[PDB]
Each structure stands twice: as C-alpha cells, then as structure tokens.
C-alpha cells in the first residue's frame, strides 16, 4: 500500500530590500530584506508507486515519466526543479537507489506573480522529502538546499529572501553576506501593528511579470560595471528596509510609509524595467484615491503591487482600483513556515 | 485629546446546514449550522470627537450627522444599524447621555457576497464599543446583542448564524432552538485535516446576490404554510449538517463531499431562487474540471461559491473557473473571532 504526502509553504509579499539579495551586492556591500509571508501556499505532493516508474508533475501541469535507474536524471530543460530535487535525495539519503514515486506541485499563483513562488516552490518540494524520509533538515538547511538547488545544480541565477521566507514563514528581516552567509530576524511584532498593517494594505495583482529574469541581471550588472548612480539608488534600498524594519518593531506607521516611498524610489531607480508607464498609471491612481504608498511586491514589472492606505480612504481607493486591469485582494499575514502532512501510510 | 479604537471581526464560509436557522424552522424543529471564519474582515472604527456632533460613516460611504441630543437617535432608514449600536450603548452604558465620536465601518467583502456580512458589521460595531467603553461581555452576548440590534430594533428579517460565527471565530458547529438558545460548539480540527481542506477548497465570487431577503421569506414560509416537500428538504439540509460536522472530526472527506452533495441538492429543493440557471452552468463546468462538489455560501442566488476538489484536478478546476465570470480564490481559515486595539488613548 502506497504513502501519500503533501507539504505546502506560504508565498510572500517583499516589504523592502529587494534587489540588495542579487549576488553582486549581498556579497559586495551585504544585503538587507523585509519580507512578510502571506495567506497563498505553494504545495508539494509525493505518492510512492507500485510501478517502476519516477513521475514528476507541475503547476502548469507538465509532465515526465521516466523508469527506474541507478543514474541521476538528465537536467534536459523540462521540470529540472523536481528532478534536481529528486537526484539530490536519492543521492544523499538513499544510497543512490531510485525510489518509485510520483512528486507533483501546485501553487495558489502563477508564475510573475511577485510572490517568490519559484523558490518557495522548490522549498516546498524539499519538504515533502523530509516528511517522506524523515530528514532532520533544520530550518537554516532546508533554505539553504532550496538555494544550492535551484542556482547551483539548475543554474538558475536569482535572489536570496525567497527561500528563507518559504521556510521560516512570517515576518523576517534578512541579512545576506559573502559567501552564503544568511541571517534570519524573526520580527515579534506587536499584535496592534499586525492589526493596524493589514487594516491598512491593499493589494491588487496587475498581471504576470515577464521582467524578472531582466531586473535581477540589471541589478547585479549595476554592481560589477561599477554604474555610480544605479549602485547609489541600490545602496538606498538597503537603508530604507532597514528603516522600515525599525518603524515596525518601534509601531511607527509614519515612518513605515515615508521608507516604503523613498524604497520605491530608489527601486526604480535601481534598474529599467521595475516600473512602466502602465504600472506608474496604477500607482498615480491609487494615490489620488488616498493611498500614502506602494510599491510592486518582486523584483517588480507587473505582479503584485502592494498599497499602504488610511482606513478612512481604503474603500476609496478599493473603488478605484477596480477601474484598472487587475483584481483587488485584502492582505493577511500567515506566521507558518513550510509544514507537512500524511494521507496515506 | 482624541481616542481612536479599531475592530474587526472575520467573514464566513457557510458549510452546512444554512436556512435551518431561519425563525420558523430553528423555532419549530431545531436547526444545525456548520460554518468557519475566513481570512476576511468587517471592521468598525470609533473616533471620540471634540465638537459635540455625532457622526455615522458606512461601507459604501454613506454618511449622517447629528448634533448631541439626550434623545435617542431616530431609525430613519439611513444608517439604522449604526444608529441603533449607538442608541443601545448610550442608553445602557453611558445612563443616556450622549458622547461626540464617529462610528465607520468597511468591509473586504461587499453586500450580498454569501459571506455573512451584514451581521459581522453588527458585531464588529459592538466590539468596538466594547472596547470604548471597557464592557464586561462575553462572546454569547455580543452575538445575542447582535441578533437583537438587528432583527428587534431595527426589524430586519435573516438567519442565526452569522453574529456567533462573527463574535466566536473557527470552525463551529452551532444548534438553534426556540426563544433565541443556541448552542455554539467550537469544533477541535485535527491539524491535518484542516490543512488537506484547505487544499482542497476553491472559493469563486459569482456577483452580488440579490435573493437572500426572498430565499429566508420562502424558507420561512414553507414552515408556516406547511409546504411538505420544501420542509422535507430543509429536514435533508439539517441532518446533513451533522453528517458534515462529524465528517470533520473523523477526518473522512469521502463523507464530506458525499454530504455536501446531498446539502447542495436539498438547499436547492427548499427555495426557488437559491440557485438558477448561471450558478448551475458553473456548478457543472466545476464538476466536469474534477471538483467533487459545491455549494453557494450564503442563501443563495449569487455571492461566493466553494468547490471541494482533490488536488490533482485543483489547477485544472482554477483555469476553469478563469473561463467563467467571477474572480477564483484560494481558502484559508482563521481561528480568531472579533478583536479590537487601540491606536489613541
Ligand atoms: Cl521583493
Ligand atoms: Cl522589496
Ligand atoms: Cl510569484
Ligand atoms: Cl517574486
Ligand atoms: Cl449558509
Ligand atoms: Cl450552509
Ligand atoms: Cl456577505
Ligand atoms: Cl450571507
């Protein structure tokens, strides 16, 4: 009789710091994220099989199949994340033996959401793994795993706060360095601010970013051909996430939205294409309506943008944002990291 | 110097049992309510003001102003709810005089969403005048408060559930008798459960409803004209609510959708226009995606809709759902009933 598993980790607004995770900068200067994470969960299935067969399952729902072998799965370009995984378990737990088996994923947003959904995809992934095998991966060293997997064995180039907001859950504030070297603050922030946050954010998805990839390699060329003034505004993301950081353990919401302004400044700033004139049309309007700030949640480009409003102009600006291109959604804060759980056996 | 006190109380999910808590049905036979608190808010704010005005602000922005009088406020039509809130303290907690300070309400969900939210916005203008003036009441009397506001002073007709449901928070399962006794027994999920049902949830807002108001009167009247067959299906709606609740502590989703099915076909049979020929076209497209079963939150006629959907089909149900009008979301649950804070004084 067959074991059936799920794991899922919460996806994550970005508050302030990103671009100060892309490689050059944490290891150059050292980098500072604020991240929150959210009530929308990336999740990862395995059930083990009577067949000898592996089989891997996506979001977009792509599919492989391969037999039974004793040779690690050929990286070929489709659904490398599950086989890496998967090739790293095996190799690492099971004395290189296959296990037949079928490791599936899904996830409450699409990919360019802004919402870290590709790493904490791998996360998630991992910790179905550690539920089936019963792994004593600590919480440092499935962030990590999640790291080395998706940007050393799969060569994808990236930041560094997805992994640790998948697995740790709640809100961090982050310290990157040279060298892997990561320090996670769980924030104790006082139940009123929680409140007083989540009465006062609106959030409203304006469509898959396809910038991403572009922003991050912008962001780290900055760094490496030495572009003063791209560096500068870098350099300013870093300060602000600290500040916004201090204005949410001291309860200070003046403060909050003057760094998440001066944040989404030195953002755009930072690289081309984290804003356009469409985003910049939805952030105008929403100011007009009331809102004291915003800023789009990932590297930026489209996906989620997050907006700080008074609550005596929230329906307001509610109203207004349902005459743009995007739907609108409430903001609640999960403080969970990655969790599993078992179906069968 | 000013005090500025906030709310909130979450929305809810109606799972089982919906229009046995209707006055004649619960009054004559009993009724049975499952319902859970979700990750959406009513909220209240009160602001004590310096000039000797009352003010009345509401979810979709209406507003009245009056000038300190030791009489109590007239129900007019405009804003009755929040004036009868107000009448209610003053009277009884403040020996009739008046205090200068607005009473606002907004809400993640509009009216007619199958969520709840016109008693929730009841409780949560009660609790924060709970908080204003530090009153020693418990959960039951904030929701019998509620109830009475509502349905006595100010004579609107509805159902039971939704001011414990408001005030308690979680997963209940409440029992209503005559002379207003109910019964809330909170129910203790096991951890696993709660998450492979949260997986398994999809919520789709079809539009606002429009028959509540006609589906409670139909309810009703089946019981008072004894309509045999419409009172047979109301007795179906009932037992399966039990069959649902012990679903739940069992951890037996089998039994769950298989009560939900038969819940979905007798809330159908017990008023005319709980469903119609749109929310059919998407209750069948749901089911020819792969969801197992559904139902509309509220009364019926439109609002939020949930699908149980075992997580293979889940993505595929999600893009579906996309095809159709109405906006697709994710369910997650909350533990918390209603709770204030204070941001001055
Ligand atoms: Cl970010
Ligand atoms: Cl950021
Ligand atoms: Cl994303
Ligand atoms: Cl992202
Ligand atoms: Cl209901
Ligand atoms: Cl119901
Ligand atoms: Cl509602
Ligand atoms: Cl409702």
Redesign the interface.
């Known amino acids: 009789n067959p074991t059936i598993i799920?794991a899922?980790a919460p996806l994550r607004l970005g508050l302030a710091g990103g671009g100060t995770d892309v490689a050059p900068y944490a290891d150059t200067f050292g980098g500072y994220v604020l991240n929150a994470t959210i009530?929308?969960?990336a999740?990862a299935?395995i059930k083990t099989l009577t067949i000898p067969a592996v089989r891997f399952?996506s979001?977009?729902?792509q599919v492989e199949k391969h037999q039974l072998i004793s040779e690690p799965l050929e990286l070929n370009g489709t659904l490398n994340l599950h086989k890496a995984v998967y090739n790293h378990m095996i190799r690492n737990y099971n004395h290189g033996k296959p296990i037949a088996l079928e490791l599936?994923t899904?996830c409450?947003a699409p990919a360019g959401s802004g919402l870290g959904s590709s790493s904490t995809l791998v996360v998630v992934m991992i910790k179905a793994f550690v539920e089936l095998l019963n792994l004593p991966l600590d919480d440092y060293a499935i962030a990590q795993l999640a790291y080395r997997i998706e940007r050393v064995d799969c060569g994808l180039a990236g930041g560094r706060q997805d992994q640790y907001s998948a697995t740790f859950g709640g809100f961090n504030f982050m310290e990157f360095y040279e060298e892997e070297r990561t320090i996670v603050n769980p924030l104790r922030i006082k139940?009123?601010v929680l409140?007083?946050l989540?009465?006062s954010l609106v959030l409203f998805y304006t469509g898959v970013s396809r910038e991403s990839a572009k922003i991050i390699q912008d962001q780290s060329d900055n760094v490496v051909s030495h572009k003063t003034a791209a560096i500068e505004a870098m350099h300013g993301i870093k300060r602000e996430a600290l500040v916004m950081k201090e204005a949410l353990l001291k309860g200070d919401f003046k403060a909050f939205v003057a760094s998440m302004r001066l944040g989404w400044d030195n953002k755009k700033n930072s690289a081309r294409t984290v804003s356009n004139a469409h985003i910049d049309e939805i952030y105008d309007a929403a100011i007009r309506a009331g809102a004291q700030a915003g800023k789009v949640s990932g590297a930026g480009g489209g996906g989620f943008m997050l907006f700080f409003v008074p609550?005596?102009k929230?329906?307001?600006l509610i109203r207004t944002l349902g005459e743009y291109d995007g739907?609108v959604?409430?903001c609640?804060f999960?403080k969970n990291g990655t969790?599993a759980?078992?179906?069968a056996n």
Request: aromatic content about 14%; hydrophobic content about 25%.
């Open positions: 799920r899922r009530d929308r969960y999740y299935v399952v979001t977009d729902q599936s899904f409450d139940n009123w409140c007083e989540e009465a609550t005596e929230r329906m307001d739907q959604s409430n609640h999960t969790q759980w078992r179906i």
